[PDB]
Motif scaffolding. Structure first.
Motif, PDB file in Angstrom:
ATOM      1  N   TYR A   1     -10.879  13.324 -32.453  1.00 40.67           N
ATOM      2  CA  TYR A   1     -11.626  12.514 -33.455  1.00 40.67           C
ATOM      3  C   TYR A   1     -12.903  13.306 -33.790  1.00 40.67           C
ATOM      4  O   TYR A   1     -13.313  14.088 -32.916  1.00 40.67           O
ATOM      5  CB  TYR A   1     -12.045  11.166 -32.863  1.00 40.67           C
ATOM      6  CG  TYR A   1     -10.930  10.224 -32.486  1.00 40.67           C
ATOM      7  CD1 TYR A   1     -10.185  10.410 -31.333  1.00 40.67           C
ATOM      8  CD2 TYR A   1     -10.643   9.117 -33.265  1.00 40.67           C
ATOM      9  CE1 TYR A   1      -9.163   9.545 -30.982  1.00 40.67           C
ATOM     10  CE2 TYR A   1      -9.621   8.244 -32.931  1.00 40.67           C
ATOM     11  CZ  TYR A   1      -8.882   8.454 -31.783  1.00 40.67           C
ATOM     12  OH  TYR A   1      -7.882   7.588 -31.444  1.00 40.67           O
TER      13      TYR A   1
ATOM     14  N   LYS B   1     -16.965  13.533 -36.251  1.00 40.08           N
ATOM     15  CA  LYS B   1     -18.009  13.128 -37.194  1.00 40.08           C
ATOM     16  C   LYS B   1     -19.038  14.253 -37.335  1.00 40.08           C
ATOM     17  O   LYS B   1     -19.594  14.723 -36.338  1.00 40.08           O
ATOM     18  CB  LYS B   1     -18.687  11.842 -36.724  1.00 40.08           C
ATOM     19  CG  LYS B   1     -19.714  11.242 -37.649  1.00 40.08           C
ATOM     20  CD  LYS B   1     -19.061  10.497 -38.808  1.00 40.08           C
ATOM     21  CE  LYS B   1     -20.098   9.790 -39.668  1.00 40.08           C
ATOM     22  NZ  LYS B   1     -19.472   9.062 -40.812  1.00 40.08           N
TER      23      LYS B   1
ATOM     24  N   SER C   1     -22.788   6.178 -33.703  1.00 41.54           N
ATOM     25  CA  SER C   1     -21.874   6.210 -34.835  1.00 41.54           C
ATOM     26  C   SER C   1     -20.456   6.226 -34.285  1.00 41.54           C
ATOM     27  O   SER C   1     -20.240   6.610 -33.135  1.00 41.54           O
ATOM     28  CB  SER C   1     -22.139   7.417 -35.713  1.00 41.54           C
ATOM     29  OG  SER C   1     -21.853   8.607 -35.044  1.00 41.54           O
TER      30      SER C   1
ATOM     31  N   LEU D   1     -16.633   7.841 -34.597  1.00 46.24           N
ATOM     32  CA  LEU D   1     -15.838   8.970 -35.076  1.00 46.24           C
ATOM     33  C   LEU D   1     -14.452   8.613 -35.601  1.00 46.24           C
ATOM     34  O   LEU D   1     -13.789   7.687 -35.118  1.00 46.24           O
ATOM     35  CB  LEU D   1     -15.717   9.958 -33.938  1.00 46.24           C
ATOM     36  CG  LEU D   1     -16.846  10.921 -33.767  1.00 46.24           C
ATOM     37  CD1 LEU D   1     -18.189  10.226 -33.542  1.00 46.24           C
ATOM     38  CD2 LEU D   1     -16.541  11.766 -32.641  1.00 46.24           C
ATOM     39  N   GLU D   2     -13.995   9.368 -36.606  1.00 45.43           N
ATOM     40  CA  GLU D   2     -12.708   9.094 -37.231  1.00 45.43           C
ATOM     41  C   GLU D   2     -11.639  10.062 -36.729  1.00 45.43           C
ATOM     42  O   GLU D   2     -11.972  11.169 -36.319  1.00 45.43           O
ATOM     43  CB  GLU D   2     -12.851   9.193 -38.748  1.00 45.43           C
ATOM     44  CG  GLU D   2     -13.819   8.183 -39.333  1.00 45.43           C
ATOM     45  CD  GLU D   2     -13.858   8.223 -40.836  1.00 45.43           C
ATOM     46  OE1 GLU D   2     -13.181   9.049 -41.397  1.00 45.43           O
ATOM     47  OE2 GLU D   2     -14.549   7.424 -41.423  1.00 45.43           O
ATOM     48  N   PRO D   3     -10.348   9.693 -36.717  1.00 46.49           N
ATOM     49  CA  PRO D   3      -9.251  10.543 -36.279  1.00 46.49           C
ATOM     50  C   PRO D   3      -9.200  11.841 -37.069  1.00 46.49           C
ATOM     51  O   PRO D   3      -9.381  11.834 -38.284  1.00 46.49           O
ATOM     52  CB  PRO D   3      -8.023   9.687 -36.619  1.00 46.49           C
ATOM     53  CG  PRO D   3      -8.520   8.265 -36.585  1.00 46.49           C
ATOM     54  CD  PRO D   3      -9.929   8.328 -37.125  1.00 46.49           C
TER      55      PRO D   3
END
Lengths: 48, 42
Positions: free
Chosen positions: B7, B9, B21, B23-25
């Motif tokens: 993942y 960011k 924050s 995190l995205e995949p």
């Protein structure tokens, strides 16, 4: 020499051979299921 | 994380910001490698 041969031989392919001796192209599909993600899948049967 | 996934960011800062924050995949796929150690590629 006597009773000693190179292990490989050529195929004498001619258009004049009977069908059993004409060349054939063969493709074999081996399908493997591994721990890896599937990546080879047919088309999706979607609709409207 | 271990199967192996990543993942991420990426944000500017000005030695980490004191914040939160999520995190995205980024990467998601098994390979069959036991990952117990790692090193970066320079």
């Amino acid at each position: 020499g006597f009773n000693c041969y190179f292990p490989l031989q050529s195929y004498g392919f001619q258009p004049t051979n009977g069908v059993g001796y004409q060349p054939y192209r063969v493709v074999v599909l081996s399908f493997e299921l591994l721990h890896a993600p599937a990546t080879v899948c047919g088309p999706k049967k979607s609709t409207n | 994380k271990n199967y192996f996934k990543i993942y991420s960011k990426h944000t500017p800062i000005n030695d980490l910001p004191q914040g939160f924050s999520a995190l995205e995949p980024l990467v998601d796929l098994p390979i069959g490698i036991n990952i117990t150690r790692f090193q970066t590629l320079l």
